[PDB]
């Protein structure tokens, strides 16, 4: 059973059918056993794609609503609301998986940081469309606990620790409107990883996140 | 209301939500008025995106299905589920063409455009048909293209992008579905040469380049 659902999720991924992929990995998670690295990466990939499509459509429609008659504005508004409901339902589904299964079963610091980052991300997507104060604080609290754990248990070049710093820096910039704290957090993460330059299997992923941290710093300084 | 359905379809398009876009254009069509050129292009774009997603997925999974026992059956079943979606999309489009678009089309340009679309959607059914229901599907695609082909040769300039795109797709039908590369090459080269002889020009020269790219691929 669990095996078959994982193989169906992989098939759906190759077919670029991410809603199918996410439904497979949701069912795996609901079986209540701690996920392997491979399973949690499938779950993360599936939902990031599913929510990413809705966030992209929301930005396009939200903006059309803001640049607009009255009949046309209202159409855009109602369509924005429809996409928002899809996006909210997806975030709530992931956050429910995180509360009920993933975070309670996480037996290692690496996975606890992984899931607390995910929780930070999905409240941050809720914050993008938000009630907003409470959502923002839930995001900030998940990131902050992830951040403390990763600093205590992970090397500064660990891709999960770097990816957490990238996303928490984006949260400070874009959600909290605290650009100086965003730049401070991103520059420290980049500089500490440069100082300790890593195993074979992580070269590519750590350094790719380093490039994104520096690209954000370039953008936010220029 | 037509006009507001059309606005919704443009917004769906902007949001890259092509299933929403197609549902809006299906509703516009089902109001029974002849579609404007803008509406016709919206309908075509929406469904070409919606069916294109399933054809792309089908090709991936089908490929895995063949290149592999419990795992072969799982791929087979998934391929079947994608095929059902694809077949339902094509059937939807083909009903709209039969019931509303082809009978109401009052200009040769429209009539060619929709008969080509009918050739196309039976061709996508032909790509996934197996067993006994294939020869009849292939024949329906061929007959639709042939009708479109005879009207376009009579009524349209050889450089008209609709006439050129019909030659492009009909030549693909002969190559990929009828396994008739000589007929495919001859149809594509004639369409190219006839447009050269009598030389929307951006669309026209783009499709001429595609005609000659297929000739190069099929010769090579």
């Amino acid at each position: 059973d669990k095996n078959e659902l994982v193989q169906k999720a992989k098939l759906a991924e190759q077919a670029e059918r991410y809603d199918d992929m996410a439904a497979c990995m949701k069912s795996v998670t609901e079986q209540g056993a701690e996920l392997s690295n491979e399973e949690r990466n499938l779950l993360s990939v599936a939902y990031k794609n599913v929510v990413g499509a809705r966030r992209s459509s929301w930005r396009v429609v939200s903006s059309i609503e803001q640049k607009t008659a009255e009949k046309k504005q209202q159409m855009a508004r109602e369509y924005r609301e429809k996409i928002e409901t899809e996006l909210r339902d997806i975030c709530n589904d992931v956050l429910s998986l995180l509360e009920k299964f993933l975070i309670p079963n996480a037996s290692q610091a690496e996975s606890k940081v992984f899931y607390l980052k995910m929780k930070g991300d999905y409240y941050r997507y809720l914050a993008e469309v938000a009630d907003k104060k409470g959502i923002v604080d839930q995001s900030q609290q998940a990131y902050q606990e992830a951040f403390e754990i990763s600093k205590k248990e992970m090397q500064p070049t660990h891709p999960i620790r770097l990816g957490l710093a990238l996303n928490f820096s984006v949260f400070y910039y874009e959600i909290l409107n605290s650009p100086e704290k965003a730049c401070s957090l991103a520059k420290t993460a980049f500089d500490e990883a440069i100082a300790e330059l890593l195993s074979e299997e992580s070269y590519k992923d750590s350094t790719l996140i380093m490039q994104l941290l520096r690209d954000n710093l370039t953008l936010w300084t220029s | 209301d037509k006009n507001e359905l059309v606005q919704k379809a443009k917004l769906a398009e902007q949001a890259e939500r092509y299933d929403d876009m197609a549902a809006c254009m299906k509703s516009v069509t089902e109001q029974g008025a002849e579609l404007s050129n803008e509406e016709r292009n919206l309908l075509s774009v929406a469904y070409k995106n919606v069916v294109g997603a399933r054809r792309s997925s089908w090709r991936v999974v089908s490929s895995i299905e063949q290149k592999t026992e419990k795992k072969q059956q799982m791929a087979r079943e998934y391929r079947e589920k994608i095929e059902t979606e694809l077949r339902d999309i094509c059937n939807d489009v083909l009903s709209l063409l039969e019931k509303f678009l082809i009978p109401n089309a009052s200009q040769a340009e429209s009539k060619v455009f929709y008969l080509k679309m009918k050739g196309d959607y039976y061709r996508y059914l032909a790509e996934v048909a197996a067993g006994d229901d294939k020869k009849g599907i292939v024949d329906q695609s061929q007959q639709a293209y042939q009708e479109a082909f005879e009207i376009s040769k009579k009524e349209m300039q050889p450089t008209h992008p609709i006439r050129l795109g019909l030659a492009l797709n009909f030549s693909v039908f002969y190559y990929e579905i009828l396994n008739s590369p000589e007929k495919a090459c001859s149809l594509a080269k004639t369409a190219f040469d006839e447009a050269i002889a009598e030389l929307s020009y951006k669309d026209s020269t783009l499709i001429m380049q595609l005609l000659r790219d297929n000739l190069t691929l099929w010769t090579s």
């Binding site: 991300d121 990816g163 990238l166 996303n167 984006v170 910039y173 874009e174 790719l208 996140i209 994104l212 690209d215 954000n216 953008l219 936010w220 | 292009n41 075509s44 774009v45 070409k48 995106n49 080509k116 196309d120 992008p161 795109g165 019909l166 492009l168 797709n169 030549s171 693909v172 190559y175 990929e176 669309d203 499709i207 595609l210 790219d213 297929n214 691929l217 099929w218």
Partner: peptide, 14 residues
């Protein structure tokens, strides 16, 4: 913009 963590041809759309 800012970043967070990550055969024959037929007729195309016009």
């Amino acid at each position: 913009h800012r970043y967070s963590t990550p055969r024959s041809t037929s007729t195309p759309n016009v």
